[PDB]
Symmetry: D2
Amino acid sequence: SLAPEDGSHRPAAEPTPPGAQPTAPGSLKAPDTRNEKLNSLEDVRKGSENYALTTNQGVRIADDQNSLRAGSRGPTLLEDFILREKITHFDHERIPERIVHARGSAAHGYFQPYKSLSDITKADFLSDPNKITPVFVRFSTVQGGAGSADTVRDIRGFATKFYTEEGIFDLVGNNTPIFFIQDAHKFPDFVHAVKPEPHWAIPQGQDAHDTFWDYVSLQPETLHNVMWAMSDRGIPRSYRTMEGFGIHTFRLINAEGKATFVRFHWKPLAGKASLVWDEAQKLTGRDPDFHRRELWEAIEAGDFPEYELGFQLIPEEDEFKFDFDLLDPTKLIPEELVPVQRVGKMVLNRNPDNFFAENEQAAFHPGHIVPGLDFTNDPLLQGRLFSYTDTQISRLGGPNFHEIPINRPTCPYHNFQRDGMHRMGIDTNPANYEPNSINDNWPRETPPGPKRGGFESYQERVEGNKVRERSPSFGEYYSHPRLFWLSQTPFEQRHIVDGFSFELSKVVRPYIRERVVDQLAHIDLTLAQAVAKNLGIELTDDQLNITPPPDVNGLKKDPSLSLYAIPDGDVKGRVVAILLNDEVRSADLLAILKALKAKGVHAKLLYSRMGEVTADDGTVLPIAATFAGAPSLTVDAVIVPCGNIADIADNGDANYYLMEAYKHLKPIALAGDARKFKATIKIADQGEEGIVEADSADGSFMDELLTLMAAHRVWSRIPKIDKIPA
Amino acid sequence: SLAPEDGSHRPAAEPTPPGAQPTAPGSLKAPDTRNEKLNSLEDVRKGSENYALTTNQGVRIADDQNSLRAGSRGPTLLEDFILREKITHFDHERIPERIVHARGSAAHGYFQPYKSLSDITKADFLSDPNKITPVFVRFSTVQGGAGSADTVRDIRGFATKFYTEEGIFDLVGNNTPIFFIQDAHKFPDFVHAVKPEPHWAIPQGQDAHDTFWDYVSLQPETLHNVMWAMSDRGIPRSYRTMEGFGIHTFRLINAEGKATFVRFHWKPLAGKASLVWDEAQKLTGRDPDFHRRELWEAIEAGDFPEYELGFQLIPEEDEFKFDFDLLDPTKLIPEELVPVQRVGKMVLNRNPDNFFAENEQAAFHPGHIVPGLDFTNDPLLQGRLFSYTDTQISRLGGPNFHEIPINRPTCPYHNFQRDGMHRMGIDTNPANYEPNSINDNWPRETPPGPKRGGFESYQERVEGNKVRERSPSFGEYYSHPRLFWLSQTPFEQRHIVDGFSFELSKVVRPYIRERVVDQLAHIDLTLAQAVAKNLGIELTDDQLNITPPPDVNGLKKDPSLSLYAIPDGDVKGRVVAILLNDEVRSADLLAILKALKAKGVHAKLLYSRMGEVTADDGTVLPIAATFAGAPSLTVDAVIVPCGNIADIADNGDANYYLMEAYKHLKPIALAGDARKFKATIKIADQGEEGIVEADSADGSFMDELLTLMAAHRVWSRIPKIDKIPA
Amino acid sequence: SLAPEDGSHRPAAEPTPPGAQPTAPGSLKAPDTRNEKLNSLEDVRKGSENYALTTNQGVRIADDQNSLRAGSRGPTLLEDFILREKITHFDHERIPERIVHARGSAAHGYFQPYKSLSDITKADFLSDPNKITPVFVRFSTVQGGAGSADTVRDIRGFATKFYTEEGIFDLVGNNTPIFFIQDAHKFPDFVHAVKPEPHWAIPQGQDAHDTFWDYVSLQPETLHNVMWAMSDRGIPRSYRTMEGFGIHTFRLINAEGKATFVRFHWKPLAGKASLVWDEAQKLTGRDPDFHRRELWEAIEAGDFPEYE
Amino acid sequence: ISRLGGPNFHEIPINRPTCPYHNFQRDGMHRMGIDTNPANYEPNSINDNWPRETPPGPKRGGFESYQERVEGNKVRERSPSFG
Ligand code: HDD
Ligand code: HDD
Ligand code: HDD
């Protein structure tokens, strides 16, 4: 018995806030959170407590500390089969990572529609507001390996496996509404250009290098998603605070056989929020697991990630009514033209038990659809359909990857397919072919119908010659980038310009930077000029004279394309650093902590060392982390309570904490003599918007602080931060 | 509905004789035959009746006859995910075959001891006669591929997986009591020498080629097993009628820690029986699946394969009491010196459901032992311990092959090993290492003990220098071959000579044949001379003068080494061909079938066409096969009833049936006018031992036939067969 | 032609200081730098300039920008074998990373002894001061994945393959002179304890978590190498400025059959130097490829890494 | 991909073309060819876009599919002419 006698090794099996208890496998942390998929995994869940340690063949091991040798200082013997089994399993633990989105974090949850959608689709999982469908969702970055950092600038994946009663449906989306390229034949080129360069394998998790911008400069179709990635969309605060999109136009098919075109959306109920670049980049060093950690801890705290599924629906007869082609995945459908109709809610409420078994081995593929859905001729979607089945043959070791437990349907599956590596199902059917008489032709085909019918493809008319040709309706590259640019606030536009400027500064061949700037001048001259000024490049008179691309269907902006133009803040689940001193005003700390708790905001008590400090009144304050150990990068706001401020006033870490939080536009609140830190951040005596200050933490101090947190960051501080040495 | 109205598509779920019903998966043929392992496989058995045909993701298929195309004569579309999943699974069905023993046939059963062995071993499965241990047994040839023929001349494997309460123990043996080589380092040399030659990959399932005999001629340690392989041991009648051996000396360890040396035996309760070479060779062309078929149908009929497990036990103090080294796997322990103690019985009573999932994927390995067993320094066994865990990583795809259902232990298994390709178990342990505090160190090591204890190696003393050197005690090659030769009946010696003669005649390089005859002259001059005579080789005076090797501990024979010297014939499960005519004497047929039924012998009614014939009293006799369709090779004896003999008397195929059966030494019985067929096989009017003839098929006629069948073949016939052109 | 007319896309094939030119494949940056191993790879090196783009079966491709479809807005056809070959190869690019030391940076070079060692060893590569042996060296971290950062706190691997005339010798060492554990049977326990924890797969490239310190606390044999890892040895400035060690005692065997015990060392001729923790940790965010980059650029500059 | 272990099966010697082959495909299990191209994508400027596409033509040209006419709905249907 090596556990502490007080039982403190084991986290409580109840919701607890971030940092309050060690994290644990979901079935131990939250044994009563169930759904039909979680329950179906019980056949493979393995416990440990009270069991003997064995080999994989069930033989009990007596001494798991030593190899078998001839003499206690002698050579290891070949006959040690316990050693060799254990080292062999170790030696073959790794499987190939995903070719793209190798870095990702996943959770289980459930989805339910708000009302039946039978009028527009026969998909069973959308047929009844009381039908609950379990989900497994993985969120990811794109470029970096499985061991890369989370808060890089990149697109994010947002992949949802719906375990429906009529089959698995995987909605395999990203967090921006378009992709970089038009036709899947170019996917290896694009991916190779953004991935680490092939001679030296640098850089990891960064588009900031020559080959990515070379390809962008040569393929202007890429510019629209490049605009999104260079905005603060590329650096989300959390997977809970980003949008999701299926990108492609798909079809819904109802029981009468009518097709409606659809694009899929996820709206985050926590709101949209992103980091700023300097914070994101520094956070990749201070905590490369920050998004993975934040998702796991939100679920352990009960701050369940919630998202609303929504559809943009366009009738078949309106296919050609826009200035862009609906089948072109580099174009978005502005919500001002086609609104998102709310469909249902997804809540992620339990972590996995074992990351490798459930996250690493999960296989999502957008070809996994169900009756009631269908594809379109989008030429990027069409090639995706080939890739996601083919890649699993190496990644997951063969054609039986649907028998890996996380991938299994919860509905029935029966067919004539047999064998393959790793075959788990032992088929008893006398027949392995159809048509057969020897088993009365079972299992049997099922005609299509309104419910529980076979899959039949929508009978779309095809007419044309066999060509490798891009549709001319796809040959427009700048109007969507411009619509995105004009829809952003002034501070978002600044962050875009700073994104392009920072990334192009890392491109060693200057002509590439020049070619990118020339493309920017086809989108918007103000953008192009601002980036050029940061790169020391002067636009030519020709460039100054490029006419801007047209409006998109009459629109000159669409505010739903901005993260921040329309307030959607939610403070629940956010966190505040509280910088302690060795004699904290206890009345301040009571008021601060209860106000935060009332709004579901978490706190971390920080000091210059671990252990405890004692408040003016004798209250013992346990310390969560030191100032350097939990930097301001990891919090949303900073509060400094009154007390003995001299204890920390000359602490360089405490001062720099406030300087970093101030640079990154975070709300900062200072009570009583903590206002002596105004000099560290150069705040005027009469104060400034974004800094809460008062004689004590009472009255409206915490409400003012919370109001600032609901607006996420103090954008008005931006011109004040250039001078700050931080 | 495609099944026939009358239900004749589905075999009865009751025991039935070979040929009476179509064969079926074991759980459908014998649903009520149960054991703990078969019951534990219920989680992975999948049915089929009444279920819809789906993709592997659970989506119902409407049309499983057509690809999706643009127009009904148009090109196939990439978006056809149904067709690609089905073709992808097909394209990846095969896995590598086993390096050796790739051809094999398997069944489920159970083992039970006759008495507790706790005085000599603490192995839990041998602790109590009421301990029932499920087994899965795979019988195999050695050289040929998984698609090669069964009745080749070869060594046979006999591998038994015991699913004990203290771990899987695999007894991985062959059907002769020694192996070809002494040290595992030479196994790839020997196996490459016997396998198809590397330039052109010929010959399949045959040792009859230059490289095999080149290795043998240069490595006289092989000669003992080569003598077995050249005897009729090399061509068993059935997996049910051969012996099995573990070959190596292992140890039993009791609760006191005392080690006893043990060699393992399986004694077939159906008796020992083999084919003759011509019959075996021709059977590889008429039915290359004969042993697989015979095993499956025996079990379907309730002719369960039964074997007694036997131990030769040698106390530790007697290690050096023999003329040969107990660790040398090319030496046998004569039963006259150390008797086989009969310790328990194994019954194989259920065929698999799916060959690939349960037989092809089964992994047996002799390093899978349990507490109460241990290894010795036998240098062939020592190297085997490395190979059987290593080879599964490619064959079965990775280190989780114990999770493939058929391989899973039925007792608990818990450890800190994680991940690997197609990981099924989802571990919930917070710890994946020990020692750990965070899960109170579970699962925990267990000290060795008398029951349910951890495995500890027997503390054998090792003293010597690090050397690659063969023990001098292994350097004797001829005395065991000679003891084997002297123990055979005269007809068994003739078949040995004929085996050597036929094989060496296929060696194209004559000096190799000469070098083999020289080795034979070191074993026995009579043998050497008889082989040389058939090869047109004359022994030199030096060869005529080689002194024979010494007796083995005073023995100049041991009849336990002969298949036939001691009567152990059992006719239950054997099969007779009854050659019909278009007017059968029904009284003969009743008397024949009655007497066969009484002894559990099966029959097959044969004619010149399929369909039925009608007997003299009107009984309608259904025909199982034609003369040419079910050759005499496939039966144990032939009976010709009386009736309209002129119907068949000039039938070449019916005459040849009897000539072939007669050449192969099979009993033949002829009733009434069927005695006209005496002329085709040249039998004198007075008759001949092994031909049963009488006026009708009365009761005496059948006892005489059944007595011949209990003696298997009519060996006295051998000098008459030289004249038969068949 | 997409290249700039001034030729500024292509780096000079001469030694240049870090940042002066874009980095390039070895054989194009330093075509005249050769050794027996580098030459022997010429059978499989493949160029590109002036060659047509083809499938892997050697069929020239006319249009590498589009899939084949039925009409220019139509569905992609299964008979597009060019698209499926290209996407199949992409789909199967990745292989499993190394179980440990998955993050590493490598280079070619050569070794030669200062004098013959025939009195203590008959190894051919140590027999003659003028017999040069090619080498390939990979330096690595231990815990993190292939896409983790370079300037973590960790032990570093230092593995040298010597391509000798009497076979390959691999000296597979680390940058500290001992290991954490005594018996290989415990390696999966120790590695599992230091690797990301199994429920949530955190933390990457860091021993700073409960399971590693749990194992340490319960296995005091670890403490020596834990001391080295917590010192600035854990955060070297460059792979050029750390020591290497084989850790184990091995044997040298001379022609007379005498055995001498030996432990192997590499001394960096650039000297020993490490970062400080705040700088190392912030560098994993500002340039997670810092040691990979510094090694490649030192070789491009002519600052060849040398070790005794 | 299973039978020959991955996507570099054209590098097994019997399968290799005797004519030139050059493209932007990289890596995979058992990769033999060591690409020196600074670029592993096209279009690129950093290797002047080599290796380059080739127009179709009478000899030594790029592959182009015959522009057969396709007309019909997306169906899983046997042509009646096959019946
Ligand atoms: C033709 C190839 C191709 C194209 C054009 C795309 N992808 Fe993809 N994608 C892959 C081929 C691929 C892949 C090779 O099949 C991956 C990696 C491994 C896997 O299982 O699938 C994958 C993974 C992958 C994942 C991670 C799934 C997971 O968590 O396991 C997401 C979220 C996306 N992709 C999303 C997209 C979106 C939104 C695209 C454009 C609209 C896109 N993919 C285009
Ligand atoms: C050092 C290597 C080596 C040596 C010396 C032997 N074998 Fe072996 N044997 C193998 C390496 C191997 C193997 C490569 O590991 C096989 C092939 C596939 C498998 O799973 O194991 C195997 C399969 C195999 C099987 C088939 C098991 C099955 O049905 O799947 C049997 C019955 C034997 N062997 C029996 C023997 C006997 C009785 C030996 C000598 C006394 C012997 N083997 C020596
Ligand atoms: C019993 C298992 C075992 C143990 C006890 C060790 N290693 Fe190891 N090592 C491995 C099992 C391993 C491995 C699983 O075999 C690796 C990863 C995959 C590979 O090719 O080798 C490996 C890789 C590996 C590499 C990377 C080689 C490369 O760059 O590819 C280095 C430098 C070391 N190890 C160094 C050590 C040192 C100095 C050890 C202690 C003195 C040590 N290893 C103990």
